[PDB]
């Protein structure tokens, strides 16, 4: 079990850790989150009481270093940092626990939710989408745009998701125009899986990362990417059986975890109705289809 301490909490803020969250008052003695399960990525995120715009946060993995939060009054936000002084860090962590100023990562032992949302997400891939290689953790916020969005302005702040576009030369082999547009199996399996992602686990990892960024920060371009990667699979006649079965599990937990009041901007009507009812794979998402119907029958 690992710890992320906080120097202080100078401004009223709602702090999230993974799917959990806590209200912290201005200069309330809050000094960190403890008992964070080792073995997965995590995200700690923020929304100031005064600016319900700009939700922001940091992706990290405790194995990769000792990390902590400190409020910056010049830039006006909670920053993540790395402490390289091993002893100095255990020292701060132990004293804060002794003084019991830390919340406990509040996992129920029956709950595999976070594991199922993050099965294929790996820090090394996150840091290629959010390129800032002087930090081991990755900052994301509500307003950051994607590389594809930028083509249609500052690329240091870009989400470098893999660009998917159904009406592109990449997607369409000359002479197989109609075939490849109606049955994207080529684009999925040769171009994307074998070519760019190398395997399905990296593909699923980017899909899950995009969903979580859409969910925790309302990042609009991440929601577009998540939907694009779903549609590419469902619009392919030929998909490995292990990918279909896993996709159904992945999407089930994503739909299960989404806040009910956000289904309107986070869920693209066309993609979901096409995947569940029109696509080649209409019959391969039984769990995802049952929970979509019993929870958001209106969107369908």
């Amino acid at each position: 079990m690992n710890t992320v301490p906080f120097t202080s909490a100078p401004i009223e803020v709602t702090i999230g850790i993974d799917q959990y969250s806590f209200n912290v008052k201005e200069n309330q003695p809050f000094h960190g989150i403890k008992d964070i399960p080792i073995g997965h990525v995590h995200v700690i995120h923020f929304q100031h009481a005064d600016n319900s715009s700009m939700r922001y946060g940091y992706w990290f993995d405790c194995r990769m270093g000792n990390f902590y939060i400190q409020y910056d009054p010049k830039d006006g936000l909670y920053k993540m940092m790395e402490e390289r002084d091993g002893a100095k860090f255990e020292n701060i962590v132990h004293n804060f626990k002794e003084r019991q100023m830390m919340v406990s990562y509040p996992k129920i032992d029956e709950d595999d939710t976070w594991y199922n949302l993050t099965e294929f997400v790996q820090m090394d891939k996150i840091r290629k989408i959010v390129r800032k290689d002087e930090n081991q953790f990755s900052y994301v916020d509500s307003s950051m745009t994607t590389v594809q969005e930028n083509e249609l302005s500052d690329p240091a702040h870009s989400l470098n998701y893999t660009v998917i576009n159904f009406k592109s030369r990449e997607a369409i082999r000359p002479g197989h125009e109609m075939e490849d547009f109606l049955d994207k199996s080529y684009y999925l399996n040769t171009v994307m899986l074998q070519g760019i992602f190398k395997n399905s686990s990296n593909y699923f990892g980017e899909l899950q990362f995009a969903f979580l960024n859409a969910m925790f920060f309302g990042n609009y371009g991440s929601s577009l990417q998540w939907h694009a990667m779903i549609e590419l699979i469902c619009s392919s006649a030929t998909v490995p059986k292990h990918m279909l079965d896993k996709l159904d599990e992945i999407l089930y937990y994503q739909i299960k975890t989404l806040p009910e009041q956000y289904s309107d901007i986070l869920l693209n009507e066309r993609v979901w109705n096409i995947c569940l009812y029109s696509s080649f794979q209409k019959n391969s998402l039984h769990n995802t289809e049952k929970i979509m119907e019993n929870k958001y029958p209106e969107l369908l």
């Binding site: 009406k167 030369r169 369409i172 125009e177």
Partner: protein, 237 residues
């Protein structure tokens, strides 16, 4: 963006553009089988590709052989249309290729767009206008060359005959769409009007009769009257 009544005069500027109509690409007759079931028999069809400024028509004849052993033919028809349009563009010298292609049916956008991927600077546009180009097979010489074809074939025409020697593109296109509108609403009356007088002939190299200016005025008035009559009959007004 889409073509509507507002941006109508853009058709007659000096940017090369083509209308593509696919309504007569896949044509069938519907009949009963010996066992009483329904079957279709395809007949020869055509793609109607027209430069509205110059009158140049690129009539790509679609032979029944293209359908042989193929499924979901109405969907395939849209992709064969786009393949053939794309080939037409590739065949034209660079300075003759269009800057826009306007499809008369929105279902052609995605097929054409995919087939034009090699021409990113050619804009594929829909239209809100309700153009009558389906009645192109009511023009006797076009119907004849389509129905006689034994192989795929491109036939070129000027759909305006020599009108542009005397009138502007705008006026020519209004005349063309009025004649076709009439032919669509009531082919028999429309054709009666065009051909009543045996002393006005169709040149071997033309599609329409060699009316004088004054006679075109009377024709256009007769076609107008035909269209309004048919509207009252359709709707009881």
């Amino acid at each position: 963006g889409a073509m509507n009544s507002s941006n109508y005069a853009e058709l007659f500027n000096n940017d090369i553009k083509l209308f593509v109509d696919d309504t007569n690409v896949y044509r069938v007759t519907v009949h009963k089988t010996f066992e009483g079931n329904v079957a279709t028999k395809a007949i020869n069809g055509c793609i109607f590709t027209l430069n509205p400024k110059t009158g140049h028509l690129f009539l790509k004849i679609i032979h029944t052989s293209v359908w042989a052993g193929q499924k979901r033919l109405s969907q395939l028809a849209k992709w064969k249309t786009a393949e053939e349009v794309s080939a037409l563009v590739r065949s034209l010298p660079k300075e003759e290729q269009p800057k826009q292609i306007i499809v008369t049916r929105k279902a052609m956008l995605d097929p054409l767009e995919v087939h034009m991927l090699d021409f990113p600077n050619i804009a594929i546009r829909p239209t809100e206008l309700r153009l009558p180009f389906s009645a192109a097979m009511s023009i006797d010489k076009l119907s004849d060359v389509v129905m006689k074809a034994t192989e795929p074939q491109m036939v070129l025409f000027n759909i305006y005959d020599d009108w542009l020697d005397r009138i502007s593109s705008y006026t020519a296109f209004s005349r063309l769409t009025l004649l076709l509108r009439a032919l669509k609403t009531n082919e028999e009356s429309a054709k009666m009007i065009l051909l009543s007088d045996p002393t006005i002939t169709i040149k071997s190299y033309h599609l329409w009769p060699s009316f004088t200016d004054e006679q075109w005025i009377t024709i256009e008035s007769q076609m107008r009257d035909l269209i309004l009559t048919e509207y009252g009959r359709k709707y009881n007004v």
